[PDB]
């Protein structure tokens, strides 16, 4: 009895909303003066330590598929890539038909994945036509009609090509995302979380942990690891799904190399503009390749199958190589050092299962490429200048982007896929959700205000 309205300001209560997050970073590169394609372009100073607060007695929903910030990650990474490529040289004067022949080196009367070529150019603008020569990995090139000595760069037909300036680095840096004032970010700390439904152990932060913007396909690499045993995340509107994300509790090492020496050459294009064509290949010629501990691979796919049959309770599971489409999805792909790789993963995925460490070492063939589509756009493409000398690289596999075949009697089947870059960031942003605080609460109370 005897109750009246009262207003409380600052009441801790919230609702879900779309909101513009801040890009945040270590304040200059890895806290260093180096030039790097992410953190050298703005993205504000360091979070020294995220001030995580664990909420008592909160039950709250999360939905990693319908998430409001993955789109912003996708746009922001694209924006940094656009802003950083924009000043660099457009290779447009290079784009006309090349004469080409078999490429070679001393004690290598062929280099097989490759072609030697020569082309018309102008060394200074409105000066005389001039001839220069270089070799290209064959995948950068198309052959014009007939038996044909005539070839062209694969994208300069359809799109403008920009050379990425050799001053930059492709290296990822640990980016952070932060709330603007009056928004808040929630983590969901339950160590078994499948990416949808309620969480029962929840905490808030002004910013995410670090995320590394690694471009990759088929294999999630240099990412986080799951806290439980292996977690399998899918949508659950339908058995039909675009991607399944498998998140490992144990990293599998992969090592890779481009062992041939590269002779960089400089061909002028204009005032302060130089194109780093790929000159003579040096050393005892090999393919690019990668290596894996076969014990760890077998254990990993056994564990993955042993979890995956919990979603799919009928008898048989099977893995296979890619069905078809572009190199970008039909192979595993990544950017070790400063060149792009494409690996025929078929020997990793020939495996089968049913109801009821430096030995046997797996090694895989890789091709490499200089002309690259990004974000699956068209009309713009990137040329990678050659990295001089020879290259070694090591990274951690952390998860698989699977997709599932047609369902048939007693038999599921899966293969590597994904390739749409959003699924990489969704494979790590699955934790977070963003909310707006609505602080102006009202309630009944056993009081009234004096009139005097």
């Amino acid at each position, epitope marked *: 009895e005897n109750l009246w309205v009262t207003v409380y300001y600052g009441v801790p209560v919230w609702k879900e909303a779309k909101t513009t997050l801040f890009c945040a970073s270590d304040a200059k590169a890895y806290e260093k003066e180096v030039h790097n394609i992410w953190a050298t372009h703005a993205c504000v100073p360091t979070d020294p330590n995220p001030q995580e607060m664990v909420l008592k007695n909160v039950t709250e929903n999360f939905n990693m*598929w319908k998430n409001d910030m*993955v789109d912003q990650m996708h746009e922001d990474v694209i924006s940094l890539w656009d802003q950083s490529l924009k000043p660099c040289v457009k290779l447009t004067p290079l784009c006309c038909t090349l004469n080409c022949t078999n490429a070679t080196a001393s004690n290598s009367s062929i280099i097989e994945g490759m072609k030697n070529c020569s082309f018309n150019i102008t060394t200074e603008l409105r000066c005389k036509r001039e001839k220069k020569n270089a070799l290209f990995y064959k995948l950068d090139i198309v052959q014009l009609d007939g038996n044909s000595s005539q070839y062209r760069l694969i994208n300069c037909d359809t799109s403008v090509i920009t050379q990425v300036c050799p001053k930059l680095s492709f290296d990822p840096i640990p980016i952070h995302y932060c709330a603007p004032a009056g928004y808040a970010i929630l983590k969901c700390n339950n160590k078994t979380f499948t990416g949808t439904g309620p969480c029962n152990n929840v905490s808030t932060v002004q910013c995410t942990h670090g995320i590394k913007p690694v471009l990759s396909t088929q294999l999630l690499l240099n990412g986080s690891l799951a806290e439980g045993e292996i977690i399998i995340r899918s949508e659950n509107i339908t058995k039909n*799904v*675009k991607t399944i994300i498998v998140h490992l509790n144990e990293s599998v090492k992969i090592e890779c190399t481009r062992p041939n020496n590269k002779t960089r050459t400089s061909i002028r294009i204009g005032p302060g503009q130089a194109f780093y064509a790929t000159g003579q290949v040096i050393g005892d010629i090999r393919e690019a390749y990668c290596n894996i501990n076969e014990s760890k691979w077998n254990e990993t796919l056994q564990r993955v199958s042993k979890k995956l049959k919990e979603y799919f309770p009928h008898k048989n599971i099977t893995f296979q190589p890619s069905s*078809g489409g*572009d190199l970008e999805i039909t192979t595993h792909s990544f950017n070790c050092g400063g060149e792009f790789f494409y690996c025929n993963t078929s020997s990793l995925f020939n495996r089968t299962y049913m109801a009821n460490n430096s030995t046997r070492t797996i090694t895989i063939h890789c091709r490499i490429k200089q002309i690259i589509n990004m974000w699956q756009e068209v009309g713009r493409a990137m040329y990678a200048p050659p990295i001089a000398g020879n290259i070694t690289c090591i990274s951690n596999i952390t998860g698989l982007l699977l997709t599932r075949d047609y369902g048939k009697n007693n038999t599921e089947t899966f293969r590597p896929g994904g*390739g749409n870059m959003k699924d990489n960031w969704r494979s790590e942003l699955y934790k977070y959700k963003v909310v707006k605080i609505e602080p102006l609460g009202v309630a009944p109370t056993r009081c009234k205000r004096r009139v005097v």
Partner: antibody
Amino acid sequence: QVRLAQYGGGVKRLGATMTLSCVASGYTFNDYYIHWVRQAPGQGFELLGYIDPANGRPDYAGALRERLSFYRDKSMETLYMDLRSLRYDDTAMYYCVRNVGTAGSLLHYDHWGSGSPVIVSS
Amino acid sequence: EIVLTQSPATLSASPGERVTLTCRASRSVRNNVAWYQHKGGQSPRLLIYDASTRAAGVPARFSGSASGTEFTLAISNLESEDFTVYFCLQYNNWWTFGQGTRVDI
């Protein structure tokens, strides 16, 4: 606004190979999966498979995995379906169809192309 | 392969009547079902999806509902537009269509 035009329909010789084709317009070509579906006369509709236009990934019905192939000329917003080694029972209407989906799941169809008839007899 | 059965195969009706079409599945498909009108010799059109959501620009006379493994399409007023073929489609697992149903005089 949107369309799926089609071509390639007509009489085809017994045991031959054909490429049918479909041309999109009016929407963001990377965002929607395309499905190839057919109807033989006196039969209910049937799915051949689907293709993601963005990366060109195909997927096929288990009965036809040997005979079909899909590809796209992405700059032209244009898709092609090969069916190898035709038989009398492939005589049907063929459609390309647009499929809606969230980032997680493919769902219902929302737009059908003009349809191409095919008749298999020399 | 999830089967859809439509019933009846052909439905006898008169103009301005309310009319009901039925579809059943060999096992559960949740609500992940849709209905299409198929005008003679033409590209089909979407009516309803998720067994219940009428799509944009579709006539308000169409409606639908579900119970377990069974799905129902209704039309409030038959017309020369609608004395035609219709089919149910499911997208829960794999895609599969019913044999279609014709509505006639």
